[PDB]
Design a protein around this nucleic acid. Structure first.
Lengths: 50, 294, 50, 197
RNA sequence: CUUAGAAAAGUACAGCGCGGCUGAAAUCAUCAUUAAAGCGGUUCACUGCCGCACAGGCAG
């Protein structure tokens, strides 16, 4: 933190590999187009406080 | 100097590479691999006998997401980085980075070792937005082997131009769809990406059957291999990393000289030996993105 | 029977409600909140001091 | 009556796979340079991860086996303290009989072997019939096989390094033919003659 | 070198009868998890034969 480089950070330590696990979502090959749908409604509940 | 929150978003967005097998009838079927286990799992993937040529296709999309930081704790460093990007664009230009990023797309670097023993492989891509025919490269092994060879193409200036506009203008975007054609020898070894865990490949189901794949991150490494661009000059094969913090040419030791670089880029002609290369490295790291929090 | 990625109901509500561009030095719309909080920049406008 | 002599790989830092491959090589050489095929080869001990540290040659004829173990390779390795040789011991009645059958199935199960099989079918298609399409044939998604050692070998007439593999299995304790292939294999085309430990 | 020296508390036994916890209910409004990633076979299991065999066997 706001200082000189840490002494133990040698060439090997900073170049090792750190694994990670993420969720990967992608369009399958051969598809045509992604379709998304949802529903939203407008009401008059702002006229009088709950 | 580094704010508690500072994150960038990648500008280059490569996708997965899916291998296809082309038969003499020109019908295409997804490539498949065998898995052998002993009673330890070893995976084998070879071109089936009688196949004409392997075909690989993927899409890479450029965008102007390096214009401003995605998140920024302090406003001062935000305008500092924005002004740095503007000054670099106005004084040096995006031609060098665009050419270095586009050559790896066209020369088949993203194929890694799959192009080792192929007789000839072609790269044809359809950019977007486009107004004419598809850009085509034939016999990369012999024809296109240098920057001059690539520039002598019919429309090399046009394709590299749309990358410059995409990087410069906000909301600007250029999308490429590459399609390699590998004329591999009969029953030649195909080397896809191996999943983290022996030899076991990454697989995604195509047309109801599993197929070998090259990871999206792995293809991005080959596309961005312009120096691989990173915070430190990490080399995968030889463990040692160049641009070590002691060497004073890492990302952070260069990023913290932002005021000096701003003064240099606006005062006089920058030296092409030291300052220009540092600017190229800084913008290459910005394009990759990440977090520079501490 | 297949798990699918979605966009949260509160997240889509946070999207169609990004209409607030009336803050003192406004440039881009924000999500309508009691303290006009920006997300791309950590600091929030419409502070009670203002 | 069967007679056997055994040899042990004394050095601890050694690939007994390679040593057994060399032993089978000299054995095959003797089985051609001379016309006899009496002597078979057995391993008194076998491990799922490596072939045993000892290899025992079993033959129906005593003189043939003793003459075989006088081959130049064995003599020039004996004085080097790399080999220890037993003179001869009559087969005990308490021994067990198992067969070290060579498996030709793996050579076709492999990918290049599958390609060879399809090419052989294409060549044999000269027997008149509708021309088949290679696209129909495909490799299995998953293949499971039993433990094997795949010792290793190199052809002499042509420079092709074909790798031989043997699978151990128990068999009936009696078979009087005492015949084998060019190498002791317990999978002779005629019969699967067992060998003792 | 012990408030030193020594020492059998043991025989019998029935806790039994009987029981209604019941009435009533509103938990209650708003919400962006977001940024970034090579797990790597240099050779190694090849090429023939038989059989109609996406069968199963041969050899070098």
């Amino acid at each position: 933190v706001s200082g000189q480089p840490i002494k133990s950070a040698t060439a090997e330590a900073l170049a090792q590999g750190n694994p990670h696990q993420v969720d990967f979502c992608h369009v399958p090959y051969g598809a045509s187009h992604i379709e998304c749908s949802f529903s939203v409604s407008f009401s008059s509940e702002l006229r009088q406080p709950y | 100097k580094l704010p508690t929150n500072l994150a960038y978003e990648r500008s280059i967005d490569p996708s997965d590479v899916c291998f296809f097998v082309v038969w003499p009838d020109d019908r295409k079927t997804p490539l498949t691999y065998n898995s052998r286990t002993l009673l330890h799992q070893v995976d084998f993937c070879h071109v089936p006998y009688g196949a004409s040529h392997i075909e690989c296709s993927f899409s890479v999309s450029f965008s102007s997401e390096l214009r401003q930081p995605y998140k920024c704790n302090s406003s001062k460093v935000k305008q500092t980085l924005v002004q740095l990007v503007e000054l670099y664009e106005t004084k040096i230009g995006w031609t060098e980075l665009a050419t270095r990023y586009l050559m790896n797309i066209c020369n088949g670097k993203w194929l890694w070792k799959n192009t080792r023993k192929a007789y000839c492989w072609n790269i044809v891509l359809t950019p977007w937005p486009w107004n004419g025919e598809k850009v085509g490269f034939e016999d990369i092994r012999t024809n296109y082997t240098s920057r001059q060879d690539f520039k002598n193409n019919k429309n090399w200036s046009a394709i590299v131009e749309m990358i410059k506009t995409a990087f410069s203008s906000t909301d600007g975007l250029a999308i490429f769809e590459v399609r390699a054609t590998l004329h591999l020898p009969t029953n030649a070894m195909v080397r896809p990406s191996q999943v983290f865990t022996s030899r076991v490949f990454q697989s995604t189901t195509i047309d109801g059957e599993r197929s070998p794949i090259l990871g999206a991150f792995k293809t991005g490494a080959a596309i961005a291999t312009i120096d691989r661009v990173g915070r430190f000059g990490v080399h995968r094969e030889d463990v040692t990393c160049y641009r070590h913090p002691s060497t004073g040419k890492d990302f952070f030791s260069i990023l913290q000289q932002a005021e000096h670089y701003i003064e240099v880029l606006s005062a006089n002609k920058t030296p092409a030996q030291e300052t220009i290369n540092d600017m190229h490295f800084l913008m290459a790291n910005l394009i990759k993105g990440g977090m520079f929090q501490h | 029977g297949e798990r699918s990625p979605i966009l949260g109901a509160f997240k889509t509500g946070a999207a169609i409600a990004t209409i607030d561009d009336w803050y003192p030095e406004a440039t881009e719309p924000l999500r309508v909140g009691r303290f006009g909080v920006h997300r791309e920049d950590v600091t929030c406008y419409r502070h009670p001091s203002t | 009556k069967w007679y056997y002599k055994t040899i042990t790989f004394l050095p601890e830092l050694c690939n007994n796979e390679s040593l057994a491959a060399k032993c089978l090589r000299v054995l095959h050489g003797f089985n051609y340079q001379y016309e006899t095929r009496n002597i078979g080869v057995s391993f008194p001990l076998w491990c799922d991860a490596t072939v045993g540290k000892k290899i025992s040659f079993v033959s129906k004829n005593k003189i043939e086996l003793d003459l075989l173990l006088k081959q130049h390779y064995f003599v020039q390795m004996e004085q080097l303290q790399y080999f220890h040789i037993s003179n001869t011991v009559l087969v005990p009645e308490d021994c067990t009989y198992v067969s070290f059958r060579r498996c030709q199935s793996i050579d076709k199960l492999t990918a290049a072997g599958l390609a060879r099989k399809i090419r052989r079918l294409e060549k044999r298609a000269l027997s008149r019939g509708e021309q088949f399409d290679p696209s129909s044939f495909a490799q299995k998604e998953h293949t499971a096989i039993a433990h094997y050692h795949s010792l290793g070998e190199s052809s002499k007439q042509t420079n092709r390094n074909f790798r031989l593999n043997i699978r151990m299995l128990s068999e009936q304790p009696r078979e009087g033919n005492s015949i084998f292939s060019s190498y002791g294999l317990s999978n002779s085309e005629n019969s699967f003659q067992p060998v003792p430990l």
